[PDB]
Amino acid sequence: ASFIPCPVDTSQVILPPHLEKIRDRLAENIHELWGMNKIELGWTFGKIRDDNKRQHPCLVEFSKLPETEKNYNLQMSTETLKTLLALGCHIAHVNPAAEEDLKKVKLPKNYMMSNGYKPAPLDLSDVKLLPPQEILVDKLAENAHNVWAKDRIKQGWTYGIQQDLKNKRNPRLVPYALLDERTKKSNRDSLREAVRTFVGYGYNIEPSD
């Protein structure tokens, strides 16, 4: 009950047009990682959403996505960059040549789907994030929790030892430092691949010193 989520204020941040391409790149790789994981959980493609057969219609390439899903991944990529800028980060395209080496992951035949779409995430296995970039991920992860926690609380949700819908109780409405470590390691990673994505295109993620 002493938990007060005050997330980073991004309401005054305008995303510069020179970051439009790299935010299109991030949004695309998030979707590719979404497909790969969904396939890793036994999902396949279906013209209609069928949970019994694990049939998902959005297992397509980023272009053929409907406008709702496409804007959804674009907004998540935009808010990630706006959050970085809000924390005082400078995003400079310091090594444009990195896009030369950049190659995607070749996944085995099972990952190929009936409609002809095989997800191909970037091969960022060679990208090694630095101390300042790992601290950026931790701050990015703690804020996504605070963004979510603030929104649920304002909708009437309070912390409970158990979750029940009618009384608006949720055990995850606690400080981030007190959450499930398996949960803490889950979005850590989704965000660590986002930071590795920016380095993969030759962008510098510096903190303001």
PDB file of C-alpha atoms in Angstrom:
ATOM      1  CA  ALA A   1       0.000   0.000   0.000  1.00  0.00           C
ATOM      2  CA  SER A   2       3.108   2.196   0.312  1.00  0.00           C
ATOM      3  CA  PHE A   3       3.669   1.530  -3.401  1.00  0.00           C
ATOM      4  CA  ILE A   4       3.567   4.688  -5.531  1.00  0.00           C
ATOM      5  CA  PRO A   5       4.368   4.118  -9.229  1.00  0.00           C
ATOM      6  CA  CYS A   6       5.595   7.397 -10.745  1.00  0.00           C
ATOM      7  CA  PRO A   7       6.810   6.448 -14.236  1.00  0.00           C
ATOM      8  CA  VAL A   8       9.108   8.485 -16.466  1.00  0.00           C
ATOM      9  CA  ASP A   9       7.216  11.420 -18.016  1.00  0.00           C
ATOM     10  CA  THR A  10       7.329  11.044 -21.813  1.00  0.00           C
ATOM     11  CA  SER A  11       4.372  13.349 -22.536  1.00  0.00           C
ATOM     12  CA  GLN A  12       6.599  16.194 -23.800  1.00  0.00           C
ATOM     13  CA  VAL A  13       9.005  14.061 -25.864  1.00  0.00           C
ATOM     14  CA  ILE A  14       8.783  14.231 -29.660  1.00  0.00           C
ATOM     15  CA  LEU A  15      10.517  11.365 -31.428  1.00  0.00           C
ATOM     16  CA  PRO A  16      12.919  12.861 -34.016  1.00  0.00           C
ATOM     17  CA  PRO A  17      12.277  11.798 -37.623  1.00  0.00           C
ATOM     18  CA  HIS A  18      15.879  10.544 -37.837  1.00  0.00           C
ATOM     19  CA  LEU A  19      14.862   7.747 -35.432  1.00  0.00           C
ATOM     20  CA  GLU A  20      11.888   6.612 -37.517  1.00  0.00           C
ATOM     21  CA  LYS A  21      13.819   3.899 -39.362  1.00  0.00           C
ATOM     22  CA  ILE A  22      15.405   2.403 -36.242  1.00  0.00           C
ATOM     23  CA  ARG A  23      11.995   2.310 -34.559  1.00  0.00           C
ATOM     24  CA  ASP A  24      10.650   0.503 -37.619  1.00  0.00           C
ATOM     25  CA  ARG A  25      13.539  -1.936 -37.206  1.00  0.00           C
ATOM     26  CA  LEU A  26      12.862  -2.563 -33.512  1.00  0.00           C
ATOM     27  CA  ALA A  27       9.126  -3.081 -34.062  1.00  0.00           C
ATOM     28  CA  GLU A  28       9.887  -5.624 -36.800  1.00  0.00           C
ATOM     29  CA  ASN A  29      12.307  -7.622 -34.637  1.00  0.00           C
ATOM     30  CA  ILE A  30       9.880  -7.632 -31.692  1.00  0.00           C
ATOM     31  CA  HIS A  31       7.307  -9.281 -33.961  1.00  0.00           C
ATOM     32  CA  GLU A  32       9.845 -11.780 -35.304  1.00  0.00           C
ATOM     33  CA  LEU A  33      10.757 -12.738 -31.730  1.00  0.00           C
ATOM     34  CA  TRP A  34       7.023 -12.948 -31.002  1.00  0.00           C
ATOM     35  CA  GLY A  35       6.551 -15.455 -33.814  1.00  0.00           C
ATOM     36  CA  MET A  36       9.582 -17.552 -32.846  1.00  0.00           C
ATOM     37  CA  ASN A  37       8.482 -17.842 -29.229  1.00  0.00           C
ATOM     38  CA  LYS A  38       4.864 -18.560 -30.178  1.00  0.00           C
ATOM     39  CA  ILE A  39       6.114 -21.290 -32.523  1.00  0.00           C
ATOM     40  CA  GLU A  40       8.354 -22.519 -29.698  1.00  0.00           C
ATOM     41  CA  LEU A  41       5.134 -22.936 -27.683  1.00  0.00           C
ATOM     42  CA  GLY A  42       3.595 -25.183 -30.351  1.00  0.00           C
ATOM     43  CA  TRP A  43       1.612 -22.546 -32.243  1.00  0.00           C
ATOM     44  CA  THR A  44       0.889 -22.737 -35.967  1.00  0.00           C
ATOM     45  CA  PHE A  45      -0.848 -20.524 -38.513  1.00  0.00           C
ATOM     46  CA  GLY A  46      -4.570 -20.430 -39.170  1.00  0.00           C
ATOM     47  CA  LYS A  47      -6.729 -18.093 -41.247  1.00  0.00           C
ATOM     48  CA  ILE A  48      -8.838 -17.855 -38.069  1.00  0.00           C
ATOM     49  CA  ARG A  49      -7.738 -17.667 -34.439  1.00  0.00           C
ATOM     50  CA  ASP A  50      -8.194 -21.196 -33.014  1.00  0.00           C
ATOM     51  CA  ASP A  51      -6.765 -21.778 -29.526  1.00  0.00           C
ATOM     52  CA  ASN A  52      -7.707 -25.467 -29.495  1.00  0.00           C
ATOM     53  CA  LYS A  53      -5.378 -26.262 -32.405  1.00  0.00           C
ATOM     54  CA  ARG A  54      -2.959 -23.464 -31.434  1.00  0.00           C
ATOM     55  CA  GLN A  55      -3.830 -21.577 -34.627  1.00  0.00           C
ATOM     56  CA  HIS A  56      -2.780 -17.930 -34.685  1.00  0.00           C
ATOM     57  CA  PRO A  57      -3.529 -15.709 -37.711  1.00  0.00           C
ATOM     58  CA  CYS A  58      -0.853 -13.102 -36.915  1.00  0.00           C
ATOM     59  CA  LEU A  59       1.987 -15.552 -37.669  1.00  0.00           C
ATOM     60  CA  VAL A  60       2.724 -13.643 -40.877  1.00  0.00           C
ATOM     61  CA  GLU A  61       5.396 -11.224 -42.024  1.00  0.00           C
ATOM     62  CA  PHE A  62       5.278  -7.674 -40.686  1.00  0.00           C
ATOM     63  CA  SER A  63       3.910  -6.222 -43.937  1.00  0.00           C
ATOM     64  CA  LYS A  64       0.721  -8.317 -44.079  1.00  0.00           C
ATOM     65  CA  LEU A  65      -0.200  -7.511 -40.467  1.00  0.00           C
ATOM     66  CA  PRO A  66      -3.511  -5.642 -40.068  1.00  0.00           C
ATOM     67  CA  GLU A  67      -3.301  -1.985 -39.126  1.00  0.00           C
ATOM     68  CA  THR A  68      -4.229  -2.690 -35.494  1.00  0.00           C
ATOM     69  CA  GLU A  69      -1.375  -5.117 -34.802  1.00  0.00           C
ATOM     70  CA  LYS A  70       1.122  -3.128 -36.886  1.00  0.00           C
ATOM     71  CA  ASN A  71       0.481   0.124 -35.017  1.00  0.00           C
ATOM     72  CA  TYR A  72       0.567  -1.825 -31.741  1.00  0.00           C
ATOM     73  CA  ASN A  73       4.175  -2.957 -32.211  1.00  0.00           C
ATOM     74  CA  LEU A  74       5.113   0.468 -33.583  1.00  0.00           C
ATOM     75  CA  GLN A  75       3.783   2.204 -30.463  1.00  0.00           C
ATOM     76  CA  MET A  76       5.749  -0.131 -28.187  1.00  0.00           C
ATOM     77  CA  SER A  77       8.907   0.651 -30.153  1.00  0.00           C
ATOM     78  CA  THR A  78       8.160   4.385 -30.049  1.00  0.00           C
ATOM     79  CA  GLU A  79       7.567   4.481 -26.293  1.00  0.00           C
ATOM     80  CA  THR A  80      10.839   2.616 -25.750  1.00  0.00           C
ATOM     81  CA  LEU A  81      12.793   5.248 -27.667  1.00  0.00           C
ATOM     82  CA  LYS A  82      10.832   8.107 -26.107  1.00  0.00           C
ATOM     83  CA  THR A  83      11.586   6.636 -22.679  1.00  0.00           C
ATOM     84  CA  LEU A  84      15.297   6.490 -23.501  1.00  0.00           C
ATOM     85  CA  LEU A  85      15.266  10.134 -24.604  1.00  0.00           C
ATOM     86  CA  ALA A  86      13.303  11.090 -21.486  1.00  0.00           C
ATOM     87  CA  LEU A  87      15.952   9.512 -19.257  1.00  0.00           C
ATOM     88  CA  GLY A  88      18.456  11.841 -20.922  1.00  0.00           C
ATOM     89  CA  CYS A  89      19.937   9.485 -23.511  1.00  0.00           C
ATOM     90  CA  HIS A  90      21.560  10.572 -26.765  1.00  0.00           C
ATOM     91  CA  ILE A  91      20.849   8.276 -29.716  1.00  0.00           C
ATOM     92  CA  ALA A  92      23.446   8.925 -32.424  1.00  0.00           C
ATOM     93  CA  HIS A  93      23.990   6.788 -35.532  1.00  0.00           C
ATOM     94  CA  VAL A  94      27.717   6.518 -34.912  1.00  0.00           C
ATOM     95  CA  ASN A  95      28.470   3.338 -36.921  1.00  0.00           C
ATOM     96  CA  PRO A  96      26.244   3.141 -40.007  1.00  0.00           C
ATOM     97  CA  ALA A  97      28.523   0.399 -41.350  1.00  0.00           C
ATOM     98  CA  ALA A  98      27.248  -2.126 -38.784  1.00  0.00           C
ATOM     99  CA  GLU A  99      24.208  -2.676 -41.013  1.00  0.00           C
ATOM    100  CA  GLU A 100      26.620  -4.313 -43.480  1.00  0.00           C
ATOM    101  CA  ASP A 101      27.483  -7.223 -41.162  1.00  0.00           C
ATOM    102  CA  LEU A 102      23.976  -7.517 -39.719  1.00  0.00           C
ATOM    103  CA  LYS A 103      22.549 -10.975 -40.437  1.00  0.00           C
ATOM    104  CA  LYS A 104      19.402 -12.698 -39.202  1.00  0.00           C
ATOM    105  CA  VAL A 105      19.061 -16.106 -37.560  1.00  0.00           C
ATOM    106  CA  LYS A 106      18.466 -19.093 -39.843  1.00  0.00           C
ATOM    107  CA  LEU A 107      16.003 -21.348 -38.012  1.00  0.00           C
ATOM    108  CA  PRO A 108      15.391 -25.040 -38.846  1.00  0.00           C
ATOM    109  CA  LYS A 109      12.629 -26.350 -41.101  1.00  0.00           C
ATOM    110  CA  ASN A 110      10.076 -26.784 -38.299  1.00  0.00           C
ATOM    111  CA  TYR A 111       9.994 -22.999 -37.791  1.00  0.00           C
ATOM    112  CA  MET A 112       8.735 -22.597 -41.380  1.00  0.00           C
ATOM    113  CA  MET A 113       4.977 -22.121 -41.427  1.00  0.00           C
ATOM    114  CA  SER A 114       2.257 -23.304 -43.787  1.00  0.00           C
ATOM    115  CA  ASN A 115       1.615 -19.852 -45.273  1.00  0.00           C
ATOM    116  CA  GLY A 116       5.297 -19.627 -46.261  1.00  0.00           C
ATOM    117  CA  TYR A 117       6.359 -17.365 -43.374  1.00  0.00           C
ATOM    118  CA  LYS A 118       9.381 -18.314 -41.290  1.00  0.00           C
ATOM    119  CA  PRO A 119      10.388 -15.825 -38.581  1.00  0.00           C
ATOM    120  CA  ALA A 120      13.981 -14.618 -38.913  1.00  0.00           C
ATOM    121  CA  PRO A 121      15.109 -12.626 -35.871  1.00  0.00           C
ATOM    122  CA  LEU A 122      18.368 -10.714 -35.979  1.00  0.00           C
ATOM    123  CA  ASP A 123      21.508 -12.611 -34.991  1.00  0.00           C
ATOM    124  CA  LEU A 124      22.584 -10.326 -32.153  1.00  0.00           C
ATOM    125  CA  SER A 125      24.475 -13.128 -30.378  1.00  0.00           C
ATOM    126  CA  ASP A 126      27.673 -11.147 -31.011  1.00  0.00           C
ATOM    127  CA  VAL A 127      26.352  -7.965 -29.350  1.00  0.00           C
ATOM    128  CA  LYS A 128      27.754  -7.527 -25.833  1.00  0.00           C
ATOM    129  CA  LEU A 129      26.019  -4.817 -23.826  1.00  0.00           C
ATOM    130  CA  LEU A 130      28.077  -2.536 -21.606  1.00  0.00           C
ATOM    131  CA  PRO A 131      27.565  -1.496 -17.962  1.00  0.00           C
ATOM    132  CA  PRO A 132      25.717   1.723 -18.915  1.00  0.00           C
ATOM    133  CA  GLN A 133      23.447  -0.195 -21.296  1.00  0.00           C
ATOM    134  CA  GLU A 134      22.587  -2.872 -18.728  1.00  0.00           C
ATOM    135  CA  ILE A 135      21.645  -0.149 -16.236  1.00  0.00           C
ATOM    136  CA  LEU A 136      19.458   1.344 -18.965  1.00  0.00           C
ATOM    137  CA  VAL A 137      17.609  -1.971 -19.293  1.00  0.00           C
ATOM    138  CA  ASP A 138      17.013  -2.188 -15.540  1.00  0.00           C
ATOM    139  CA  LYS A 139      15.563   1.322 -15.554  1.00  0.00           C
ATOM    140  CA  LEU A 140      13.515   0.463 -18.654  1.00  0.00           C
ATOM    141  CA  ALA A 141      12.187  -2.681 -16.959  1.00  0.00           C
ATOM    142  CA  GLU A 142      11.311  -0.977 -13.672  1.00  0.00           C
ATOM    143  CA  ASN A 143       9.400   1.728 -15.572  1.00  0.00           C
ATOM    144  CA  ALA A 144       7.289  -0.630 -17.696  1.00  0.00           C
ATOM    145  CA  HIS A 145       6.153  -2.128 -14.386  1.00  0.00           C
ATOM    146  CA  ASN A 146       5.431   1.348 -13.021  1.00  0.00           C
ATOM    147  CA  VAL A 147       3.584   2.315 -16.211  1.00  0.00           C
ATOM    148  CA  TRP A 148       1.449  -0.816 -15.944  1.00  0.00           C
ATOM    149  CA  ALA A 149       1.005  -0.557 -12.170  1.00  0.00           C
ATOM    150  CA  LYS A 150      -0.078   3.094 -12.358  1.00  0.00           C
ATOM    151  CA  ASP A 151      -2.654   2.335 -15.054  1.00  0.00           C
ATOM    152  CA  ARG A 152      -4.216  -0.615 -13.208  1.00  0.00           C
ATOM    153  CA  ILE A 153      -4.314   1.242  -9.879  1.00  0.00           C
ATOM    154  CA  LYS A 154      -6.127   4.212 -11.422  1.00  0.00           C
ATOM    155  CA  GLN A 155      -8.680   1.741 -12.822  1.00  0.00           C
ATOM    156  CA  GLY A 156      -9.478   0.621  -9.257  1.00  0.00           C
ATOM    157  CA  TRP A 157      -6.957  -2.181  -8.716  1.00  0.00           C
ATOM    158  CA  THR A 158      -5.345  -2.716  -5.311  1.00  0.00           C
ATOM    159  CA  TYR A 159      -2.732  -5.199  -4.162  1.00  0.00           C
ATOM    160  CA  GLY A 160      -4.029  -8.525  -2.935  1.00  0.00           C
ATOM    161  CA  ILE A 161      -2.411 -11.726  -1.765  1.00  0.00           C
ATOM    162  CA  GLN A 162      -4.587 -13.418  -4.407  1.00  0.00           C
ATOM    163  CA  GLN A 163      -5.975 -12.199  -7.725  1.00  0.00           C
ATOM    164  CA  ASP A 164      -9.723 -11.823  -8.144  1.00  0.00           C
ATOM    165  CA  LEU A 165     -11.396  -9.771 -10.840  1.00  0.00           C
ATOM    166  CA  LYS A 166     -14.532  -8.392  -9.157  1.00  0.00           C
ATOM    167  CA  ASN A 167     -12.575  -6.891  -6.237  1.00  0.00           C
ATOM    168  CA  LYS A 168      -9.729  -5.624  -8.479  1.00  0.00           C
ATOM    169  CA  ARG A 169      -6.905  -7.401  -6.645  1.00  0.00           C
ATOM    170  CA  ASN A 170      -3.555  -8.357  -8.128  1.00  0.00           C
ATOM    171  CA  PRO A 171      -0.410  -9.583  -6.328  1.00  0.00           C
ATOM    172  CA  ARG A 172       1.909  -7.955  -8.884  1.00  0.00           C
ATOM    173  CA  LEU A 173       0.947  -4.455  -7.633  1.00  0.00           C
ATOM    174  CA  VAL A 174       4.113  -4.201  -5.539  1.00  0.00           C
ATOM    175  CA  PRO A 175       7.490  -2.454  -6.011  1.00  0.00           C
ATOM    176  CA  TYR A 176       9.554  -3.874  -8.863  1.00  0.00           C
ATOM    177  CA  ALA A 177      12.414  -4.845  -6.536  1.00  0.00           C
ATOM    178  CA  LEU A 178       9.946  -7.212  -4.816  1.00  0.00           C
ATOM    179  CA  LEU A 179       8.541  -9.014  -7.877  1.00  0.00           C
ATOM    180  CA  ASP A 180       9.000 -12.592  -9.063  1.00  0.00           C
ATOM    181  CA  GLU A 181      12.591 -13.132 -10.163  1.00  0.00           C
ATOM    182  CA  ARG A 182      11.348 -15.255 -13.062  1.00  0.00           C
ATOM    183  CA  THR A 183       9.113 -12.322 -13.988  1.00  0.00           C
ATOM    184  CA  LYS A 184      11.969  -9.854 -13.475  1.00  0.00           C
ATOM    185  CA  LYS A 185      14.207 -11.937 -15.761  1.00  0.00           C
ATOM    186  CA  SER A 186      11.489 -12.134 -18.438  1.00  0.00           C
ATOM    187  CA  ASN A 187      11.086  -8.467 -19.480  1.00  0.00           C
ATOM    188  CA  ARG A 188      14.674  -7.811 -18.678  1.00  0.00           C
ATOM    189  CA  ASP A 189      15.384  -9.941 -21.649  1.00  0.00           C
ATOM    190  CA  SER A 190      12.847  -8.635 -24.020  1.00  0.00           C
ATOM    191  CA  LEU A 191      14.321  -5.200 -23.306  1.00  0.00           C
ATOM    192  CA  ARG A 192      17.946  -6.357 -23.438  1.00  0.00           C
ATOM    193  CA  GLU A 193      17.343  -7.558 -26.996  1.00  0.00           C
ATOM    194  CA  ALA A 194      15.792  -4.169 -27.781  1.00  0.00           C
ATOM    195  CA  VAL A 195      18.955  -2.376 -26.636  1.00  0.00           C
ATOM    196  CA  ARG A 196      21.040  -4.937 -28.522  1.00  0.00           C
ATOM    197  CA  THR A 197      18.883  -4.146 -31.564  1.00  0.00           C
ATOM    198  CA  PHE A 198      19.961  -0.493 -31.529  1.00  0.00           C
ATOM    199  CA  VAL A 199      23.643  -1.442 -31.279  1.00  0.00           C
ATOM    200  CA  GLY A 200      23.048  -3.933 -34.093  1.00  0.00           C
ATOM    201  CA  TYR A 201      22.239  -1.053 -36.456  1.00  0.00           C
ATOM    202  CA  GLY A 202      25.168   1.062 -35.283  1.00  0.00           C
ATOM    203  CA  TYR A 203      23.351   3.345 -32.846  1.00  0.00           C
ATOM    204  CA  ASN A 204      25.011   4.677 -29.704  1.00  0.00           C
ATOM    205  CA  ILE A 205      22.941   4.582 -26.516  1.00  0.00           C
ATOM    206  CA  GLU A 206      24.724   7.020 -24.282  1.00  0.00           C
ATOM    207  CA  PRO A 207      23.666   8.284 -20.857  1.00  0.00           C
ATOM    208  CA  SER A 208      23.973  12.006 -20.232  1.00  0.00           C
ATOM    209  CA  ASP A 209      27.152  12.558 -18.215  1.00  0.00           C
TER     210      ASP A 209
END
